[PDB]
Amino acid sequence: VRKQEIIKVNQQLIEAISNGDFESYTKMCDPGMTAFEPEALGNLVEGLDFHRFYFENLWSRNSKPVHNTMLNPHIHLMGDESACIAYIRITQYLDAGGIPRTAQSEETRVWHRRDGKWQHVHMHRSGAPSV
């Protein structure tokens, strides 16, 4: 049940990403969160400004059909206020010719309850870039 709560809070963050809602993303993330991701070219980025840039400049891709599947998530619980979730993300989309395609990425996300709310403190993403 506690694992299912981690799945729900993590899926709420994934919803905020799919809807491009940076306010939902910002409140849901510790303002000191760090990130490894292909867009950062092997560097650890801190704060939310780096990710704000990607939220505000992907409007060319709205209305383009995409669907994201989270595959068999694995959750480590570490007390009552700490959790880590790992899963394969699969993205179905359409290329230029309209042909459906698929991309895979692996995601680790670390969650921490601060002040009674689950906070997103670290993400690690490998595989196909989100852009």
Ligand X SMILES: O=C(O)Cc1cc(O)ccc1Nc1c(Cl)cccc1Cl
Binding residues for a copy of itself, rule: CB under 8 A, are 34, 36, 38-46, 49-50, 52-54, 56-58, 60, 65, 67, 69, 71-72, 74, 76, 78-82, 84, 86-88, 90, 92, 94, 96-104, 106, 108, 110-113, 121-122, 124, 126-127, 129, 131
- Edge-to-edge strand list for the sheet holding 29-36: 45-46, 29-36, 117-127, 100-114, 82-94, 67-77
**Closest CA relative to residue 70, chosen from 50, 52, 92:** 92
* Main-chain phi, psi angles of 80, to 5 degrees: -95, -15
Q: Is residue 50 near ligand X by the rule CB under 6 A?
A: yes
Q: Nearest distance from residue 22's CB to Na ion, in Å?
A: 16
Task: Please state, in angstroms and rounded to a whole number, the distance separating the CA atoms of residues 122 and 131.
Answer: 20
Nearest to ligand X of 34, 113 (CB atom): 34
Site string for ligand X, 60-89 (x = CB under 6 A): ------------------------------
Task: Please state, in angstroms and rounded to a whole number, the distance separating the CA atoms of residues 4 and 123.
Answer: 19
Binding site for ligand X (CB under 6 A): 17, 37, 39, 50-51, 54-55, 58, 123, 130
